[PDB]
């Protein structure tokens, strides 16, 4: 007697009043997310593969990048094909309630994980760039490792709530994927939602700003200091130190872009969410929630691409392993020069 009938999950009444979006929409959605899965898993596999095998990229900090890639790989995997894609092509979620929970639970856990991982990357950047050259700190495997343990502890904490009643993962949009329940306005769900948002999200965002705004408010602190030591009897060997800071600033610059990618990726959705939980639910329509979530899912597939066009060592690696990828973004040795000077160690001060 209806088109949203799911014998496994109880569809919130809100999604039931609307009319079924057109077949083309379902087919496109599936095809769309199915490509997020391919590019997402491919691109992140490529970054994990290269970052773990290439000795040039073998630095403690990079572990965070590995962690971010494993996070996005999984997101793209579980969230694209087959769970959602297949659902779409049938215009129905057919994998049951447990699959739904797992689906939504994985979705949030790694979403939180990627920003909190980016947080750690923002903190690393602050050590080697935000502080002065005199006290610059490089990430140590020990530090890094504990840091990713925080990331995993954390992420799971703010996404597991619904698994235990404190909130709930269920069907949303055109009913072919799952997420957290942002409609149901009771106490339990509202605190979890406020929690997910404030701790899972606003949380690492502060870390991010505090670190970058701290790296900008030290650009000059370093600009002056670079000269003080410059004329401080520092020979041609000064050039070395200079390329290194250029090197790091390049990675620091990268950080912000992948983070920017994230925000611009999740904010839309986050917003439509809160509207439904606090504002005009008549606003939160099929496409009002759907499309902005799609855009949110594809987020886990941009990092690999940002690296492929802005990471020298990594781009070097691709050129040497899957060069057919860097076609439209051809690699050149000159892109690795700054790392040469920075690493080349002057013997006995020459
Ligand atoms: C399940 C059936 C899939 C049919 C796909 C037909 C598509 C042709 C695609 C060729 C795909 C190569 C994908 C692996 C490469 C990962 C791309 C990610 C971009 C990474 C940039 C560093
Ligand atoms: C297909 C999408 C799924 C399974 C999404 C689940 C998402 C969450 C539990 C989202 C949490 C958030 C972030 C990771 C960042 C932005 C803000 C939130 C609170 C919406
Ligand atoms: C894009 C996210 C940036 C991740 C920061 C990785 C930090 C690795 O930065 C690396 O530090 C090494 C010394 O520890 C330097 O020798 C490398 O040139 C530099 O790329
Ligand atoms: C539902 C769980 C999904 C987990 C997906 C795991 C696949 C990620 C690929 C891991 C590559 C790690 C390579 C390390 C190299 C060594 O060996
Ligand atoms: C407007 C969308 C059109 C569809 C084309 C989507 C292209 C995404 C596929 C990624 C291919 C890998 C590109 C890596 C090159 C960089 O560097």
Numbering used by the authors: 9 to 358
Q: What text does the study give?
A:
Rhodopsin is the primary photoreceptor molecule in the visual signaling cascade. Indeed, bovine rhodopsin is hydrolyzed to free retinal and apoprotein after photo-activation, whereas the Meta state of squid rhodopsin is thermally stable.
In this study, we performed a crystallographic study of the LUMI state of squid rhodopsin to elucidate the essential structural change occurring in the activation process. This relaxation is accompanied by a large movement of the central moiety of retinal towards the extracellular side. Indeed, the all-trans retinal in LUMI is gently curved so as to embrace the indole ring of Trp274. The most significant difference between LUMI and RHOD is seen in the orientation of the C13 methyl group; i.e., it points toward helix VI in RHOD, whereas it points towards helix III in LUMI. This alteration is accompanied by reorientation of the Schiff base NH bond; i.e., it is directed towards Asn87 of helix II in RHOD, whereas it is re-orientated towards Asn185 in LUMI. A peculiar feature of the photoreaction of squid rhodopsin is seen in that the position/orientation of the β-ionone ring of retinal, which is tightly fixed by the surrounding aromatic residues, remains unaltered upon the formation of LUMI.
